[PDB]
């Protein structure tokens, strides 16, 4: 649907897979940038889910869809991948902010949801 | 026009439609249109710098007066931050020179050719950030993330920005002059004025009216 | 009065007034701030 | 037409369209229609939060309910003071972006995001929603709301100023004024510094 | 340059002492409270203040015991001598550009009159005072004329002798 229900989504975003109409700053307003950033989102999401010669052959073909997908499962991949990149950035930020691993901090949140979070530790809020 | 800076005077015609205009140009600096465009940008840039600076001075000082925080005073905050700064002084200057050279050249290029930093191939794929609005001094894009320039209060917000900007510019120069004249911070200066306004002002700081130029000060006293 | 003010606007009268003002200003600066060598 | 000052001139942009319209704008604050609409919504918002605040301040046994309202933050809860601030910020962020998006484009936020069959009825005003916000069909009533909202705003301001100068609870201030009114009021108390 | 600060120069101190001694020798021929005595004492006070002020300004002194000025902008800024020549350079150039711009503005304004030569020896004093006040903003206007191309007359419009 819509990232902001009531906001008017741009016309270039409609029809794309995984399009919730989110482009406030209009970076995909041109087709050349929109096609390349579609590849970048898919590659970032695929690397986040799992976390020279291979990357060179990725862009050797002159096609458009083969650089991205070499309709329901595409949206399924895009909604799962974005959560994976959010999760990895959360892992980096939490290990930078508490000094602990990503799994033991889940147990610390479970054992104290109201006294141990990003608000309490003196890194995320000075 | 927002008004007349001097009621009854003849206001210049080239300032009739500018936001924040009171017809104030007695030195005729903005009579040339290209100069006027450059000075509009310069006034906005000075306004926004002073705005942020006066915020970063006054809000810590207000919260220090309220007992909330105890951050260092503004004229000594450079020393205290530099000792604890992981980055040394020279590297900080070099980084600031590089970053501001880049961003000010981008702003300058947009001033000379409007919308030219948002064209296709201008930036490295991220040119949609910097499309501009076709208005001198109002970039938008990343700089207007909430999109409030597209609302109906945009023209009144331009006027609010300029008048608050001029007030902040005067306020920062007042901060600097008050420190040079009294040696104390701005909230202490305000409290001293509030305790005795007749005796605690610039006429008694020993600097603003030099004693040699004003011999009546040493004479007309109890 | 118009003819008299036109005479007062002739070049030597204006020169006299302006140079009296400038010389007086310099003299009074040096009276109030004696012996200025440096800024 | 009822007015705050009978016999005076009324501003031309206040014709009783709005509830509580008594022609009271001495400083001519809301003149352009965007300003007047924003100040209408802001009056509704400030008045409703002030009604809740006046109720929650006048209502306060129990060790917690014996503390002053201006010293209420020092009571011990199950969470540190930082945690509740951010949780309240998050919940308020969600409901406020919903209300703001309604304010910009009316009727835009009327549908439950997870239930497509549950939707607020159309014709919704910005400051006057419907549906689950009016479980009873109670809807003359807008004049009552705006009057109680303004009285609560003045009452909450009185709470703030009375706790700042005298340093007393509202009930203590009322009891001090009810002891001797001619000496315990704003005159004399402030004149004794 | 191998100089010494005047506040630690022995020649500077000797000069102050000698000048005060000469003025004091002149003093012991007048009664106290007389006009010559008061005038000489005022001169002595001014001499003492002058030597103190020149020592306190960080001026450098030569082997002559006299202050020597530093005028290289690099040496002045790094060693605290900008008040000797550099800041006076800025002040002079500002006033001189003011005077020149006011004169140019008055001449240009007089060029459009029906009798342009009349304003050159019978001064339009209100116009001259107005133009003189506007000379404070001369660098901005002059720089704009330079970039616009209106500061200079074109070479094809200026008379020249046969070559
Ligand atoms: C607006 C900029 C600015 C101003 C007004 C000041 C003012 C001050 N600082 Mg700070 N600083 C400033 C920026 C910066 N300072 C510092 C780092 C420090 C330290 C570490 C210390 C100070 C201290 C001081 C005080 C000492 C007085 C002095 O040395 O004069 C400096 C006078 C100035 C006017 C600042 C420098 C000139 C100019 C404003 C710089 C910016 C101009 C642009 C770069 C020009 C660019 C040209 C364009 C067109 C290409 C003084 C109140 C110290 C002090 O209080 O001692 C106890 C102290 O210890 N400052 C950095 C990090 C590199 C800055 C970055 O911009
Ligand atoms: C932003 C505007 C502003 C405000 C509100 C103040 C306020 C104050 N100043 Mg600062 N100041 C300012 C700008 C300001 N100043 C500027 C631009 C300078 C450089 C000229 C100074 C230089 C200065 C010195 C050297 C001293 C003060 C002092 C004071 C105190 C008042 C007594 C006095 O001597 O007045 C200052 C007199 C002036 C002629 C400066 C006036 C400049 C402003 C811009 C005039 C416009 C005012 C505006 C029309 C109305 C203001 C309303 C307000 C709500 C903004 C008071 C705390 C004294 C002190 O620190 O405490 C005892 C003192 O010794 N000021
Ligand atoms: C590597 C990260 C990345 C990239 C390249 C994209 C790219 C894209 N997204 Mg997507 N997204 C991401 C991460 C990303 N996303 C994350 C983490 C979420 C959170 C769930 C989303 C949620 C999202 C929604 C809901 C939608 C998009 C859409 C889009 C398209 C918008 C067009 C555009 O110009 O964006 C180009 C973006 C970039 C070039 C990256 C900008 C990075 C900035 C400059 C750095 C600073 C970011 C800061 C640190 C945080 C484009 C294909 C829209 C589309 O229609 O579907 C495909 C759409 O509706 N995204
Ligand atoms: C660097 C700051 C700066 C700049 C670039 C401008 C530029 C502009 N001003 Mg603004 N202004 C400022 C600061 C500035 N102003 C401050 C602090 C105030 C409040 C006092 C104002 C109050 C003001 C009014 C009321 C109006 C303008 C107007 C204008 C515009 C046309 C006049 C012109 O061409 O001036 C060009 C200016 C410069 C090239 C800068 C000259 C700098 C010199 C060196 C100043 C030195 C003298 C000064 C007295 C020293 C300050 C001391 C003081 C702090 C105590 C132009 C956009 C008019 C306009 O129409 O609205 C948009 C108008 O009506 N200004
Ligand atoms: C013109 C803008 C401006 C400038 C030049 C400064 C400059 C400074 N600030 Mg201020 N600040 C500003 C705007 C500014 N601030 C605003 C708008 C606010 C909100 C009111 C603050 C609130 C603030 C706080 C709360 C503190 C500073 C501190 C500092 C100092 C250290 C900054 C640092 O370590 O970087 C870090 C770089 C990052 C990118 C982060 C430095 C002197 C610190 C200080 O006073 O001493 C260390 C400090 O604790 N600032
Ligand atoms: C036109 C140049 C000029 C200027 C700017 C001044 C300026 C000043 N004169 Mg001066 N004066 C001038 C020419 C000038 N005077 C001339 C031609 C004479 C006659 C020789 C005087 C005789 C004079 C006397 C007798 C006194 C001044 C005093 C003053 C001061 C206060 C008035 C002021 C610094 C008064 C003073 O020194 O300060 C209170 C004072 O008592 N002036
Ligand atoms: C190009 C030649 C030249 C230069 C650079 C100087 C420079 C100076 N002279 Mg010498 N002088 C000269 C030629 C020169 N003079 C000639 C030809 C004579 C004989 C008529 C004199 C006779 C003379 C005397 C008798 C005195 C000077 C003094 C001065 C100082 C005046 C400073 C001042 O008034 O600040 C004030 C700043 C301003 C007026 C700037 C204007 C600011 C406006 C108002 C804004 C300055 C160092 C005085 C000084 O004390 O010597 C160190 C001094 O007593 N001059
Ligand atoms: C007539 C022109 C002239 C001359 C002959 C000099 C001569 C000198 N300068 Mg100065 N200078 C000038 C104009 C001049 N300067 C101007 C116009 C500026 C401002 C842009 C400077 C700013 C300046 C700086 C910032 C420095 C010098 C330094 C020096 C010295 C070494 C320069 C060098 O080449 O090292 C190879 C030398 C005595 C240096 C000095 O201060 O110490 C040796 C130095 O750091 N100068
Ligand atoms: C409007 C006044 C004005 C202006 C802008 C100039 C500008 C110039 N002069 Mg010309 N000059 C003037 C008046 C002026 N002069 C007068 C009245 C005389 C007769 C004494 C001269 C005699 C003259 C000579 C002999 C030379 C110049 C040269 C120059 C050039 C280099 C600067 C210089 O050498 O200054 C030096 C200026 C003088 C020695 C005389 C200045 C006299 C005063 C200070 C200026 C006049 C002020 C005016 C009366 C103000 C009235 C305005 C008021 C009514 C509003 C420059 C083009 C030189 C050259 O051509 O360079 C390439 C050169 O060799 N000038
Ligand atoms: C779209 C747009 C729109 C508008 O226009 C604007 C804006 C808003 C700006 C935008 C938005 C956005 C977003 C937010 C971005 C961000 C993102 C992501 C997060 C990235 C990633 C990121 C993520 C990804 C890369 C990833 C990576 C991962 C990796 C592999 C990992 C690795 C690891 C693992 C294996 C394990 C081992 O043992 C180790 C290691 C090795 C360590």
XYZ file of C-alpha atoms and ligand atoms in Angstrom, chain B residues 213 215-216, chain C residues 17 20-25 28 31-32, ligand 6:
55
model
C 36.951 60.681 24.405
C 35.929 63.723 29.766
C 32.545 64.508 31.358
C 34.608 74.967 5.588
C 38.415 73.717 8.777
C 36.257 70.733 9.748
C 38.936 68.187 8.797
C 41.799 70.086 10.451
C 39.701 70.728 13.554
C 38.777 67.045 13.733
C 40.795 67.553 18.538
C 44.156 66.740 21.823
C 41.954 63.998 23.290
C 35.305 71.989 13.188
C 36.190 71.272 13.849
C 35.981 70.862 15.258
C 35.483 69.638 15.904
C 34.999 68.374 15.244
C 35.576 69.987 17.347
C 35.193 69.091 18.463
C 35.132 69.337 19.785
N 35.449 70.463 20.433
Mg 36.381 71.970 19.311
N 36.987 73.971 18.316
C 37.165 74.171 17.008
C 36.859 73.106 16.037
C 36.318 71.776 16.381
N 36.063 71.213 17.578
C 37.673 75.515 16.660
C 37.989 76.071 15.299
C 37.795 76.155 17.981
C 38.272 77.546 18.306
C 39.782 77.559 18.255
C 37.344 75.109 18.935
C 37.343 75.436 20.370
C 36.839 74.501 21.387
C 36.759 74.766 22.831
C 37.154 76.010 23.564
C 36.200 73.510 23.356
C 36.016 72.677 22.251
C 35.455 71.392 22.727
C 35.179 70.365 21.675
C 34.538 69.049 22.016
C 33.077 69.179 22.438
C 32.303 70.201 21.612
C 34.652 68.284 20.719
C 35.696 67.188 20.819
C 35.258 71.488 24.195
C 36.028 70.436 24.933
O 37.233 70.361 24.801
O 35.345 69.283 25.487
C 34.283 69.460 26.417
C 35.766 72.814 24.597
O 35.797 73.278 25.790
N 36.413 73.285 21.049
